[PDB]
Amino acid sequence: MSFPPQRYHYFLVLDFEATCDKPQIHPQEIIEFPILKLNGRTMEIESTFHMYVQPVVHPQLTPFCTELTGIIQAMVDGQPSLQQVLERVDEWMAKEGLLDPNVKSIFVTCGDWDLKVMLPGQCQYLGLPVADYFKQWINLKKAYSFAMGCWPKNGLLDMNKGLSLQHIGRPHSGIDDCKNIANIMKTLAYRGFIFKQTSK
């Protein structure tokens, strides 16, 4: 069946961008915080959270970071820091109705890095608690591997290739990466896939 019933009322698509450099900067810090709220059955985008984030440990974006992500210094200057952005997320979650225990939602990311490594690592560095809703997620690469029977080599680009989808927007823009996740999910649901939590 195409677009079967799903286990969640909403899927929350997230794909950070972070400071970076060649070789890699340390520590990395989140600079773009997107969440797309997808209707759980149709995978259509119903709401968007989007904030750029001001880094503090390495406050000046490197040339490599701006080239990779397209994020220029003026986009992070004057922004709230991660601590405040996380409070804005909680407020957005509340207004969207996602803190009701009987509304079931789950984050979806391309890989485990965002919520297994990046967010808890920075929150630990800053001494910040991680909200419980960030502690479960679906790794789209793993979901795709069950839906298609194969392991994608390079993330969103190869999942779009395998599904004959045109890429949306710019790779390594957090919000555009989220739109591609959402488009891949919609196609997997069209083919009949029922999404499941993959995080441990």
Ligand SMILES: Nc1ncnc2c1ncn2[C@@H]1O[C@H](COP(=O)(O)O)[C@@H](O)[C@H]1O
């Ligand atoms: N090729 C790369 N070299 C160095 N850092 C990278 C690279 N690709 C991604 N990153 C880092 O990982 C973050 C998330 O990657 P992505 O979602 O692919 O844009 C980026 O914002 C960078 O901080």
Ligand SMILES: [Mg+2]
């Ligand atoms: Mg990513």
Ligand SMILES: [Mg+2]
């Ligand atoms: Mg990204």
